[PDB]
Coordinates of C-alpha atoms (C1' of nucleotides) and ligand atoms in Angstrom, one line a residue:
Chain A
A1 CA 70.8 -169.3 90.9
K2 CA 73.4 -167.3 89.0
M3 CA 76.8 -166.7 90.6
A4 CA 77.8 -163.2 91.4
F5 CA 80.9 -161.6 89.9
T6 CA 82.4 -158.4 88.6
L7 CA 82.8 -158.3 84.8
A8 CA 85.6 -155.8 84.9
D9 CA 86.6 -153.4 82.2
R10 CA 90.0 -152.9 83.8
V11 CA 92.3 -154.5 86.3
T12 CA 92.2 -153.3 89.9
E13 CA 94.5 -153.9 92.9
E14 CA 92.1 -156.2 94.8
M15 CA 92.3 -158.5 91.7
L16 CA 96.0 -159.0 92.5
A17 CA 95.8 -160.6 96.0
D18 CA 98.6 -162.9 97.1
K19 CA 96.4 -166.0 96.7
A20 CA 93.6 -166.7 94.2
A21 CA 92.0 -169.3 92.0
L22 CA 93.1 -168.4 88.5
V23 CA 91.5 -169.4 85.2
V24 CA 93.2 -168.5 81.9
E25 CA 90.9 -170.3 79.5
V26 CA 92.2 -171.9 76.3
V27 CA 89.4 -173.7 74.5
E28 CA 91.3 -175.1 71.6
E29 CA 92.4 -178.6 72.6
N30 CA 95.9 -178.1 71.2
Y31 CA 96.9 -175.0 73.2
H32 CA 100.1 -174.2 71.3
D33 CA 99.9 -170.6 70.1
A34 CA 96.2 -170.8 70.8
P35 CA 93.9 -168.0 71.9
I36 CA 93.1 -167.2 75.5
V37 CA 89.4 -166.5 75.4
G38 CA 88.9 -165.2 78.9
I39 CA 90.3 -164.8 82.5
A40 CA 88.7 -165.4 85.8
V41 CA 90.0 -164.6 89.3
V42 CA 88.5 -165.6 92.6
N43 CA 90.1 -164.4 95.8
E44 CA 89.3 -163.1 99.3
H45 CA 87.9 -159.9 97.7
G46 CA 85.4 -161.6 95.4
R47 CA 85.0 -163.0 91.9
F48 CA 86.2 -161.3 88.8
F49 CA 86.1 -161.8 85.0
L50 CA 88.6 -160.1 82.7
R51 CA 88.8 -159.9 79.0
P52 CA 92.2 -161.3 77.8
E53 CA 93.0 -158.2 75.7
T54 CA 92.6 -156.1 78.8
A55 CA 94.3 -158.3 81.4
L56 CA 97.2 -159.4 79.3
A57 CA 98.0 -155.9 78.1
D58 CA 98.0 -154.6 81.7
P59 CA 101.5 -154.2 83.2
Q60 CA 100.2 -154.9 86.7
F61 CA 98.3 -158.1 85.8
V62 CA 101.3 -159.5 83.9
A63 CA 103.6 -158.7 86.8
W64 CA 101.2 -160.4 89.1
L65 CA 101.2 -163.5 86.8
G66 CA 104.9 -163.7 86.9
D67 CA 105.3 -163.1 90.7
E68 CA 105.9 -166.4 92.4
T69 CA 105.1 -164.9 95.8
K70 CA 101.5 -164.4 94.5
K71 CA 100.0 -167.9 94.8
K72 CA 97.6 -169.3 92.3
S73 CA 95.3 -172.4 92.3
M74 CA 94.4 -173.6 88.9
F75 CA 93.2 -176.6 86.8
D76 CA 95.7 -177.7 84.2
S77 CA 98.2 -174.9 84.8
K78 CA 100.5 -176.3 82.1
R79 CA 97.9 -175.4 79.4
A80 CA 97.8 -171.8 80.7
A81 CA 101.5 -171.7 81.2
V82 CA 102.2 -172.7 77.6
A83 CA 99.5 -170.5 76.0
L84 CA 101.1 -167.6 77.9
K85 CA 104.7 -168.6 76.9
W86 CA 103.6 -168.2 73.2
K87 CA 102.4 -164.7 74.1
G88 CA 105.8 -164.0 75.8
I89 CA 104.2 -164.0 79.3
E90 CA 105.5 -166.0 82.3
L91 CA 103.3 -167.7 84.7
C92 CA 104.7 -168.4 88.2
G93 CA 103.4 -169.1 91.7
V94 CA 101.1 -171.9 90.9
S95 CA 100.8 -173.7 94.2
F96 CA 97.9 -176.0 93.4
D97 CA 96.7 -177.7 90.3
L98 CA 93.3 -179.4 90.7
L99 CA 93.8 -181.5 87.5
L100 CA 96.9 -183.1 88.9
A101 CA 95.4 -183.5 92.4
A102 CA 92.4 -185.3 91.1
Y103 CA 94.6 -187.5 88.9
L104 CA 96.7 -188.5 91.8
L105 CA 93.6 -189.2 94.0
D106 CA 92.2 -191.5 91.3
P107 CA 93.5 -191.7 87.8
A108 CA 90.6 -194.1 86.8
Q109 CA 88.1 -191.2 87.2
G110 CA 89.4 -189.7 83.9
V111 CA 89.0 -186.2 85.2
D112 CA 89.5 -183.8 82.3
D113 CA 87.6 -180.7 83.5
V114 CA 86.8 -178.8 86.6
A115 CA 83.3 -180.3 86.8
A116 CA 84.6 -183.9 86.9
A117 CA 87.0 -183.1 89.6
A118 CA 84.4 -181.2 91.6
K119 CA 82.0 -184.0 91.4
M120 CA 84.4 -186.1 93.4
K121 CA 83.6 -183.9 96.4
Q122 CA 79.8 -183.6 95.7
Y123 CA 80.3 -180.1 94.3
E124 CA 78.2 -179.5 91.2
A125 CA 77.8 -175.7 91.0
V126 CA 79.8 -175.8 87.8
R127 CA 79.1 -177.2 84.3
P128 CA 81.2 -179.6 82.3
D129 CA 83.3 -177.8 79.6
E130 CA 81.6 -180.0 76.9
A131 CA 78.2 -178.7 78.1
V132 CA 79.3 -175.1 77.6
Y133 CA 81.6 -175.3 74.5
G134 CA 80.0 -178.3 72.9
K135 CA 82.1 -180.9 71.2
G136 CA 83.5 -181.9 67.8
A137 CA 82.6 -179.7 64.8
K138 CA 79.9 -178.0 66.8
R139 CA 82.3 -176.8 69.5
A140 CA 82.6 -173.0 69.9
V141 CA 83.2 -170.2 72.4
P142 CA 79.8 -168.9 73.6
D143 CA 78.8 -165.2 74.2
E144 CA 80.5 -163.2 76.9
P145 CA 77.7 -163.6 79.5
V146 CA 77.7 -167.4 79.2
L147 CA 81.5 -167.6 78.9
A148 CA 82.2 -165.3 81.9
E149 CA 79.8 -167.1 84.2
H150 CA 81.4 -170.5 83.3
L151 CA 85.0 -169.3 84.0
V152 CA 84.0 -167.7 87.3
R153 CA 82.2 -170.9 88.4
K154 CA 85.3 -173.0 87.5
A155 CA 87.5 -170.5 89.4
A156 CA 85.1 -170.6 92.3
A157 CA 85.1 -174.4 92.4
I158 CA 88.9 -174.4 92.5
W159 CA 88.9 -171.9 95.3
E160 CA 86.5 -174.1 97.3
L161 CA 88.0 -177.5 96.4
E162 CA 91.7 -176.8 97.1
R163 CA 91.4 -177.6 100.9
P164 CA 89.5 -180.9 100.7
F165 CA 91.7 -182.2 97.9
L166 CA 94.9 -181.4 99.7
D167 CA 93.5 -183.0 102.9
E168 CA 92.8 -186.2 101.1
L169 CA 96.1 -186.2 99.4
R170 CA 97.7 -185.8 102.8
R171 CA 95.7 -188.7 104.2
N172 CA 96.9 -190.8 101.2
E173 CA 100.5 -189.6 101.8
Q174 CA 100.5 -188.1 98.4
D175 CA 100.9 -184.5 99.4
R176 CA 104.6 -184.4 98.5
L177 CA 103.9 -186.4 95.3
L178 CA 101.8 -183.5 94.2
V179 CA 103.8 -180.5 95.5
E180 CA 107.3 -182.0 95.0
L181 CA 106.9 -184.1 91.9
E182 CA 103.9 -183.6 89.6
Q183 CA 103.6 -179.8 90.0
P184 CA 107.3 -179.0 89.5
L185 CA 107.3 -181.5 86.6
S186 CA 104.3 -179.7 85.0
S187 CA 106.5 -176.6 84.5
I188 CA 109.3 -178.7 83.0
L189 CA 106.9 -180.3 80.5
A190 CA 105.7 -176.8 79.6
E191 CA 109.2 -175.7 78.7
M192 CA 109.7 -178.9 76.7
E193 CA 106.5 -178.6 74.8
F194 CA 107.1 -174.9 74.1
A195 CA 110.7 -175.5 72.9
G196 CA 109.5 -178.2 70.6
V197 CA 111.7 -180.4 68.4
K198 CA 113.1 -179.2 65.0
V199 CA 112.3 -181.3 62.0
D200 CA 114.2 -181.7 58.7
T201 CA 111.1 -181.6 56.6
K202 CA 113.0 -182.0 53.3
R203 CA 114.5 -185.2 54.6
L204 CA 111.0 -186.3 55.7
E205 CA 109.5 -185.4 52.3
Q206 CA 112.1 -187.4 50.4
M207 CA 111.5 -190.5 52.5
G208 CA 107.9 -190.0 51.6
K209 CA 108.8 -190.2 47.9
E210 CA 110.9 -193.3 48.4
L211 CA 108.1 -195.0 50.4
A212 CA 105.5 -194.0 47.8
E213 CA 107.6 -195.5 45.1
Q214 CA 108.0 -198.8 47.1
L215 CA 104.3 -198.9 48.1
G216 CA 103.4 -198.7 44.5
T217 CA 105.7 -201.5 43.5
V218 CA 104.5 -203.8 46.3
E219 CA 100.9 -202.8 45.8
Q220 CA 101.0 -203.9 42.2
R221 CA 102.7 -207.2 43.1
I222 CA 99.9 -207.9 45.6
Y223 CA 97.2 -207.5 43.0
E224 CA 99.2 -209.5 40.6
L225 CA 99.4 -212.4 43.1
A226 CA 95.8 -212.1 44.2
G227 CA 94.5 -212.1 40.6
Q228 CA 92.6 -208.8 41.2
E229 CA 92.7 -205.4 42.9
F230 CA 91.3 -204.8 46.4
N231 CA 91.7 -202.5 49.4
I232 CA 94.7 -204.1 51.0
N233 CA 94.1 -201.8 54.0
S234 CA 90.7 -203.4 54.6
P235 CA 91.0 -206.4 57.0
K236 CA 87.6 -207.5 55.8
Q237 CA 88.4 -207.5 52.1
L238 CA 91.9 -208.7 52.7
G239 CA 90.5 -211.6 54.7
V240 CA 88.4 -212.7 51.8
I241 CA 91.3 -212.6 49.4
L242 CA 93.4 -214.7 51.7
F243 CA 91.0 -217.1 53.4
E244 CA 88.5 -217.4 50.5
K245 CA 90.0 -216.7 47.1
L246 CA 93.5 -218.1 47.9
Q247 CA 92.2 -220.8 50.4
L248 CA 94.9 -220.0 53.0
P249 CA 94.5 -221.7 56.4
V250 CA 92.4 -219.9 59.1
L251 CA 94.6 -220.0 62.2
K252 CA 93.1 -217.0 64.0
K253 CA 89.4 -215.9 63.8
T254 CA 88.7 -212.3 65.0
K255 CA 85.5 -211.3 66.8
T256 CA 84.2 -209.7 63.6
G257 CA 85.8 -212.1 61.0
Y258 CA 89.3 -213.3 60.0
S259 CA 92.4 -212.1 61.7
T260 CA 95.0 -210.6 59.3
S261 CA 97.4 -209.3 62.0
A262 CA 101.2 -209.6 61.6
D263 CA 101.4 -212.6 63.9
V264 CA 98.9 -214.5 61.8
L265 CA 100.4 -213.5 58.4
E266 CA 103.9 -214.6 59.5
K267 CA 102.5 -218.1 60.1
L268 CA 100.8 -218.1 56.7
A269 CA 103.9 -216.8 54.9
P270 CA 105.0 -220.3 53.8
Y271 CA 101.7 -221.0 52.0
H272 CA 101.6 -218.1 49.5
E273 CA 104.0 -215.4 48.2
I274 CA 101.3 -212.8 48.6
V275 CA 101.7 -212.9 52.4
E276 CA 105.3 -211.6 52.7
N277 CA 104.1 -208.8 50.3
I278 CA 101.2 -207.9 52.5
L279 CA 103.5 -207.7 55.6
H280 CA 105.9 -205.5 53.7
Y281 CA 103.0 -203.4 52.5
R282 CA 101.8 -203.1 56.1
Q283 CA 105.3 -201.9 57.2
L284 CA 105.7 -199.2 54.5
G285 CA 102.1 -198.1 54.7
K286 CA 102.4 -197.6 58.5
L287 CA 105.6 -195.5 58.1
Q288 CA 104.0 -193.4 55.3
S289 CA 100.6 -192.8 56.7
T290 CA 101.4 -192.4 60.4
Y291 CA 104.9 -191.1 60.5
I292 CA 105.7 -189.3 57.2
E293 CA 102.3 -187.8 56.4
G294 CA 101.4 -187.7 60.1
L295 CA 104.4 -185.6 61.2
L296 CA 104.3 -183.3 58.2
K297 CA 100.8 -182.4 59.1
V298 CA 101.7 -181.0 62.5
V299 CA 105.1 -179.4 61.8
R300 CA 104.9 -175.6 62.1
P301 CA 105.4 -174.0 58.7
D302 CA 107.4 -171.2 60.1
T303 CA 109.8 -172.8 62.5
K304 CA 109.7 -176.4 61.1
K305 CA 109.2 -177.6 64.7
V306 CA 106.7 -180.0 66.2
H307 CA 105.2 -179.1 69.6
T308 CA 103.8 -182.2 71.3
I309 CA 101.6 -182.1 74.3
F310 CA 102.5 -184.3 77.2
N311 CA 99.3 -185.4 78.9
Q312 CA 100.4 -185.6 82.5
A313 CA 97.0 -186.7 83.8
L314 CA 95.9 -189.7 81.8
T315 CA 97.7 -193.0 82.2
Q316 CA 96.6 -195.4 85.0
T317 CA 100.2 -196.1 86.0
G318 CA 101.6 -192.6 86.3
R319 CA 103.4 -192.5 82.9
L320 CA 103.0 -189.6 80.5
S321 CA 101.3 -189.9 77.1
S322 CA 102.2 -187.8 74.1
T323 CA 99.9 -186.3 71.3
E324 CA 99.8 -184.2 68.2
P325 CA 102.3 -185.6 67.4
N326 CA 102.9 -188.6 69.6
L327 CA 106.7 -188.5 70.0
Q328 CA 106.8 -191.6 72.3
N329 CA 106.3 -194.2 69.6
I330 CA 108.7 -193.0 66.8
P331 CA 110.1 -196.2 65.0
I332 CA 113.4 -197.7 66.1
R333 CA 113.3 -201.5 66.1
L334 CA 113.2 -201.9 62.3
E335 CA 115.9 -200.1 60.3
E336 CA 113.6 -198.8 57.7
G337 CA 111.4 -197.1 60.2
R338 CA 114.3 -196.1 62.5
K339 CA 115.4 -193.9 59.6
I340 CA 112.5 -191.6 60.5
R341 CA 114.6 -190.3 63.5
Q342 CA 117.1 -188.8 61.1
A343 CA 114.5 -186.1 60.5
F344 CA 114.6 -185.0 64.1
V345 CA 117.4 -182.6 64.4
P346 CA 118.9 -179.9 66.8
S347 CA 117.1 -176.5 66.8
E348 CA 120.4 -174.6 66.5
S349 CA 123.6 -174.7 64.5
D350 CA 126.4 -176.7 66.0
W351 CA 124.1 -178.3 68.5
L352 CA 123.7 -182.1 69.0
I353 CA 120.9 -184.5 70.1
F354 CA 121.8 -186.3 73.4
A355 CA 119.8 -189.3 74.6
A356 CA 120.1 -191.2 77.9
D357 CA 118.1 -194.3 78.8
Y358 CA 117.7 -196.5 81.9
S359 CA 118.9 -200.0 81.3
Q360 CA 116.2 -202.5 82.4
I361 CA 114.6 -200.2 85.0
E362 CA 111.5 -202.2 85.3
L363 CA 113.2 -205.5 86.1
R364 CA 115.6 -203.6 88.5
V365 CA 112.6 -202.1 90.2
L366 CA 111.1 -205.5 90.5
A367 CA 114.3 -206.9 92.0
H368 CA 114.1 -204.0 94.5
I369 CA 110.4 -204.4 95.4
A370 CA 110.4 -208.2 95.5
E371 CA 113.8 -208.3 97.2
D372 CA 114.6 -211.4 95.2
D373 CA 118.1 -212.4 96.1
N374 CA 118.9 -214.1 92.8
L375 CA 117.5 -211.2 90.7
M376 CA 119.2 -208.5 92.9
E377 CA 122.5 -210.4 92.6
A378 CA 122.1 -210.6 88.9
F379 CA 121.8 -206.8 88.6
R380 CA 124.6 -206.3 91.2
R381 CA 126.8 -208.2 88.7
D382 CA 125.3 -206.1 85.9
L383 CA 124.5 -209.5 84.1
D384 CA 122.7 -209.7 80.8
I385 CA 119.4 -210.4 82.4
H386 CA 117.9 -212.4 79.6
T387 CA 120.9 -214.7 79.3
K388 CA 120.8 -215.1 83.1
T389 CA 117.1 -215.9 83.1
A390 CA 117.6 -218.5 80.4
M391 CA 120.5 -220.1 82.3
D392 CA 118.2 -220.5 85.3
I393 CA 114.9 -221.6 83.9
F394 CA 116.6 -224.0 81.4
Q395 CA 119.3 -225.0 83.9
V396 CA 122.4 -224.5 81.7
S397 CA 125.7 -222.6 81.9
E398 CA 126.1 -219.2 80.1
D399 CA 128.0 -221.1 77.4
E400 CA 125.0 -223.4 76.8
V401 CA 122.5 -220.6 76.3
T402 CA 121.5 -220.7 72.6
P403 CA 120.0 -217.7 70.8
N404 CA 116.5 -219.4 70.9
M405 CA 116.8 -219.9 74.6
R406 CA 117.6 -216.2 75.3
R407 CA 114.7 -215.1 73.1
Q408 CA 112.3 -217.2 75.1
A409 CA 113.7 -216.2 78.5
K410 CA 113.4 -212.6 77.3
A411 CA 109.7 -213.2 76.5
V412 CA 109.3 -214.7 79.9
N413 CA 110.8 -211.6 81.5
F414 CA 108.3 -209.3 79.8
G415 CA 105.5 -211.5 80.9
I416 CA 106.7 -211.3 84.5
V417 CA 106.7 -207.5 84.5
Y418 CA 103.3 -207.3 82.7
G419 CA 101.6 -209.7 85.1
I420 CA 102.3 -213.3 84.2
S421 CA 99.8 -215.5 82.3
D422 CA 100.3 -218.9 80.7
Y423 CA 97.9 -218.1 77.8
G424 CA 99.5 -214.7 77.3
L425 CA 103.0 -216.1 77.2
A426 CA 101.9 -219.1 75.1
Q427 CA 100.4 -216.7 72.6
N428 CA 103.5 -214.6 72.5
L429 CA 106.0 -217.5 72.1
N430 CA 103.5 -219.4 69.9
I431 CA 103.7 -222.5 72.1
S432 CA 101.1 -224.4 74.1
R433 CA 99.5 -223.1 77.3
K434 CA 101.0 -226.0 79.3
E435 CA 104.5 -225.4 77.9
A436 CA 104.2 -221.7 78.9
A437 CA 103.0 -222.7 82.3
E438 CA 106.1 -224.9 82.7
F439 CA 108.4 -221.9 81.8
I440 CA 106.7 -219.8 84.4
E441 CA 106.9 -222.5 87.1
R442 CA 110.6 -222.8 86.2
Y443 CA 111.0 -219.0 86.5
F444 CA 109.4 -218.9 90.0
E445 CA 111.7 -221.7 91.2
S446 CA 114.7 -219.6 90.3
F447 CA 113.2 -216.3 91.6
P448 CA 111.1 -217.3 94.7
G449 CA 111.2 -213.7 95.8
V450 CA 109.4 -212.6 92.7
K451 CA 106.8 -215.3 93.2
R452 CA 106.3 -214.1 96.8
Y453 CA 105.8 -210.5 95.6
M454 CA 103.3 -211.5 92.9
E455 CA 101.2 -213.4 95.5
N456 CA 101.6 -210.7 98.2
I457 CA 100.8 -207.8 95.9
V458 CA 97.5 -209.4 94.8
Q459 CA 96.5 -210.1 98.4
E460 CA 97.4 -206.5 99.3
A461 CA 95.3 -205.1 96.5
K462 CA 92.4 -207.2 97.7
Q463 CA 92.8 -206.1 101.3
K464 CA 93.4 -202.4 100.7
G465 CA 91.5 -202.0 97.5
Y466 CA 94.6 -200.5 95.7
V467 CA 98.3 -200.8 95.0
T468 CA 101.0 -198.1 95.3
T469 CA 104.3 -197.1 93.7
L470 CA 107.6 -196.1 95.3
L471 CA 106.6 -192.4 95.5
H472 CA 103.0 -193.3 96.7
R473 CA 101.1 -193.1 93.5
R474 CA 98.0 -195.3 93.6
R475 CA 95.7 -197.2 91.4
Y476 CA 92.4 -198.6 92.7
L477 CA 91.6 -202.1 91.6
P478 CA 87.9 -202.9 92.3
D479 CA 87.9 -205.8 89.8
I480 CA 90.4 -207.7 92.0
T481 CA 87.3 -209.2 93.8
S482 CA 85.1 -209.9 90.7
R483 CA 83.7 -213.4 90.4
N484 CA 84.3 -213.3 86.7
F485 CA 87.7 -215.0 86.1
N486 CA 88.7 -212.9 83.1
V487 CA 87.8 -209.7 84.7
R488 CA 89.6 -210.6 88.0
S489 CA 92.7 -212.0 86.2
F490 CA 93.2 -208.6 84.4
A491 CA 92.9 -206.8 87.8
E492 CA 95.5 -209.2 89.3
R493 CA 97.9 -208.5 86.4
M494 CA 97.4 -204.8 87.0
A495 CA 98.2 -205.4 90.6
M496 CA 101.5 -207.0 89.7
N497 CA 102.4 -204.5 86.9
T498 CA 101.4 -201.1 88.2
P499 CA 103.9 -200.9 91.1
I500 CA 106.6 -201.7 88.6
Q501 CA 105.7 -199.5 85.6
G502 CA 104.4 -196.9 88.1
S503 CA 107.6 -196.8 90.1
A504 CA 109.7 -196.6 87.0
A505 CA 107.5 -193.6 86.1
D506 CA 108.1 -192.0 89.5
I507 CA 111.8 -192.4 89.1
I508 CA 112.3 -190.9 85.7
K509 CA 110.0 -188.0 86.6
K510 CA 112.1 -187.2 89.7
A511 CA 115.2 -187.5 87.5
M512 CA 113.7 -184.9 85.1
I513 CA 113.2 -182.5 88.1
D514 CA 116.7 -183.1 89.4
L515 CA 118.3 -182.8 86.0
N516 CA 116.7 -179.4 85.3
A517 CA 117.9 -178.1 88.6
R518 CA 121.5 -179.4 87.8
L519 CA 121.5 -177.9 84.3
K520 CA 120.4 -174.5 85.7
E521 CA 123.1 -174.7 88.4
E522 CA 125.8 -175.5 85.8
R523 CA 124.3 -172.7 83.6
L524 CA 124.3 -175.2 80.7
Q525 CA 122.3 -174.3 77.6
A526 CA 121.3 -178.0 77.3
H527 CA 117.6 -178.6 77.7
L528 CA 115.1 -181.4 77.8
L529 CA 113.2 -182.1 74.6
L530 CA 111.4 -185.4 75.2
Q531 CA 110.8 -188.2 77.6
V532 CA 110.0 -191.7 76.3
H533 CA 109.1 -193.6 79.5
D534 CA 112.6 -194.9 80.2
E535 CA 114.7 -192.3 78.4
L536 CA 115.4 -188.6 78.2
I537 CA 116.2 -186.8 75.0
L538 CA 118.0 -183.4 75.2
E539 CA 119.7 -181.1 72.7
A540 CA 122.7 -178.9 73.4
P541 CA 125.8 -177.1 72.1
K542 CA 128.3 -179.6 70.8
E543 CA 130.7 -178.1 73.4
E544 CA 128.5 -179.4 76.2
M545 CA 128.6 -183.1 75.3
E546 CA 131.5 -184.1 77.5
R547 CA 129.9 -182.5 80.6
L548 CA 126.5 -184.1 79.7
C549 CA 128.0 -187.5 79.3
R550 CA 128.9 -187.3 83.0
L551 CA 126.1 -185.2 84.4
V552 CA 122.9 -186.8 82.8
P553 CA 123.6 -190.5 83.6
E554 CA 124.6 -189.5 87.2
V555 CA 121.5 -187.5 87.9
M556 CA 119.3 -190.2 86.4
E557 CA 121.2 -193.0 88.3
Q558 CA 120.9 -191.1 91.6
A559 CA 117.3 -190.0 91.3
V560 CA 116.3 -192.6 93.9
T561 CA 118.2 -195.2 95.9
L562 CA 117.2 -198.8 95.4
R563 CA 118.5 -202.2 96.7
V564 CA 120.1 -202.6 93.2
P565 CA 122.0 -200.1 91.1
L566 CA 120.3 -198.0 88.4
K567 CA 122.2 -198.1 85.1
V568 CA 121.9 -195.4 82.4
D569 CA 123.3 -195.7 78.9
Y570 CA 123.8 -192.6 76.7
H571 CA 124.6 -191.6 73.1
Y572 CA 124.7 -188.3 71.2
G573 CA 124.8 -187.2 67.6
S574 CA 123.8 -185.0 64.7
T575 CA 120.2 -186.3 64.7
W576 CA 118.0 -188.4 67.0
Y577 CA 118.8 -191.4 64.8
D578 CA 122.5 -190.8 65.2
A579 CA 122.1 -190.5 69.0
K580 CA 122.9 -194.3 69.2
Chain B
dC1 C1' 76.1 -186.7 52.1
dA2 C1' 77.8 -185.3 57.8
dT3 C1' 80.3 -186.0 61.3
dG4 C1' 81.2 -189.6 64.6
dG5 C1' 82.2 -194.0 66.9
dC6 C1' 83.8 -199.0 66.7
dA7 C1' 87.0 -202.5 64.8
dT8 C1' 91.5 -203.7 63.6
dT9 C1' 96.0 -202.7 62.9
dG10 C1' 100.7 -201.4 64.5
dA11 C1' 104.3 -198.1 66.6
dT12 C1' 106.8 -197.2 71.3
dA13 C1' 108.6 -199.0 76.4
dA14 C1' 112.8 -202.9 74.3
Chain C
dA1 C1' 100.7 -211.6 79.9
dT2 C1' 101.3 -204.0 80.8
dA3 C1' 100.7 -198.7 79.4
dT4 C1' 99.7 -195.6 75.4
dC5 C1' 98.2 -192.8 70.3
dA6 C1' 96.6 -192.8 65.8
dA7 C1' 95.7 -194.2 60.8
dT8 C1' 92.4 -196.5 57.5
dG9 C1' 88.1 -198.8 56.6
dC10 C1' 83.3 -199.2 57.5
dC11 C1' 78.9 -198.9 59.5
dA12 C1' 76.2 -196.3 62.9
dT13 C1' 73.0 -192.2 62.8
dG14 C1' 70.3 -188.7 60.8
Ligands
LIG601 O1 95.9 -179.8 78.3 C1 96.2 -181.1 78.6 C2 95.2 -181.7 79.6 O2 93.8 -181.4 79.0 C3 93.0 -182.6 79.0 C4 91.6 -182.2 79.5 O3 91.6 -181.4 80.7 O4 93.1 -183.1 77.6 C5 92.7 -182.2 76.5 O5 93.9 -181.8 75.8 C6 94.8 -182.9 75.2 C7 96.0 -182.3 74.5 O6 95.5 -181.5 73.3 C8 93.9 -183.9 74.3 O7 94.6 -185.1 73.9 C9 92.6 -184.3 75.0 O8 91.7 -185.0 74.1 C10 91.8 -182.9 75.5 O9 90.6 -183.4 76.2 C11 93.7 -183.6 80.0 O10 93.5 -185.0 79.8 C12 95.2 -183.2 79.9 O11 96.0 -183.5 81.0
MG602 MG1 116.4 -198.9 77.6

DNA sequence: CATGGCATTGATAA
DNA sequence: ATATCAATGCCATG
């Protein structure tokens, strides 16, 4: 049976109640400067559908949107907030976001539309967006009758589902996580995305020329060494040239054929000169295709800025993800790729890029959660954690720690945070399973508290069915009881890793909220641009650097209080690259 | 073709 | 041994 609603030709007073489910539909996946196809409002007075041209041109409706005393319940308010920012309209008073609520209740559900969230509470009087708009090339906004009913039904679902979702969140002790962390953060992410990051396209285009020149040289060399031309970017064809024509050893055999991954080629490097060339080709090609051509495709022609979209409701650990473009994986480890960052510049004259990062936040969180005396003392002394771990597992003094020992202790540290595994560590350090197991045993002897935590967290996940982070974010782990070893082992690693990665996520998110409040208080023009899991990137007038050097690290260091200190490093400069 | 999904690869946290 | 996003190649699918 159809749902009743008023398809209004104009805005009325009863459409402006002090509480309502609001739908400001943006069908385009990338909502930056995108069209708003329709509006729906459901309140105590009934259900209404409004045409965007009408509603958004009405002084009363716009004022209602920006009145924070007029409460709105929505789904993915960030999407509406940003689409409105591009139209010069401010959205305030959003007291409930169903997308974020569902995400906190169970990130594994993958809720991406009102229907999926509603299905969680046995409410199905609403269709999936995909069912209405279609998908892929065939997607499209349907006719008004169909469009209007869909938005009203979504608005109605939100109006109906707010209470039950809030009640469960409360049961889970996640009510504050939603209202005090995620929702406020949503507005901050909206400003960040809207502000965007300025790109020096000419710089980017020149790097593209340089890379194209080098890719040509190396590409020829490869054919010259292989005795024929082939698609180097084809693991299948490449695997034939290497393991069939050149007779190179087969150390790794992929599920579909021969492995040609970096780790394998490095081992094969000694056998033939073609290998080093393939590795180099891989590097350049990745930089060119993904970063040069990739970025240039999404930069706005007019402003020369890129506007990423931070997906706040996707990762299973509580982290954010970034898309179109992904600004959370810009090269930095290798110098050639690191150069890419020189293309990210301040949006105004005489402004500078300022970057602050937590130093070893995951291991510090581990020390806190496990309450390992040795690990807590290490951070209390602000010790080089990898040198310290080597000293312990190898039983030597700081002076006796060789570069190779630190490298291995470092690999052990990453394995501990990720959820230890002898095979996993062995694979990473290219050693035997047994030898890796010995390292791990050595590590637990030196950090008994960490061992206790790993055992306890797994048992707790088994008992409760989930694990939680410092601010009460949770992740259900049904596979923890599977009789399949591989399936269960993955769930156990997730049990060990989620509370660590997740808590580090909670902390930096709170720091973002605290920082924005401090910046406003100080009336500084500095503002957040990006977040990259453990670091915050801002831009600001050069005259604000000294104040930021003190303010940012402090706010980030005091976001939460742990059994160990939180340490934040910072750098600033003409470009992102220079902010080192 | 026609667009679409899987496989493999590699970039970030570092 | 964790969490992501996305490019190129190649076969599914019609
Ligand atoms: O608007 C972000 C928000 O929308 C979801 C779906 O509800 O993702 C959509 O938009 C993303 C940004 O363009 C795309 O990456 C994604 O493919 C599209 O479905 C949520 O996951 C997200 O939180
Ligand atoms: Mg760091």
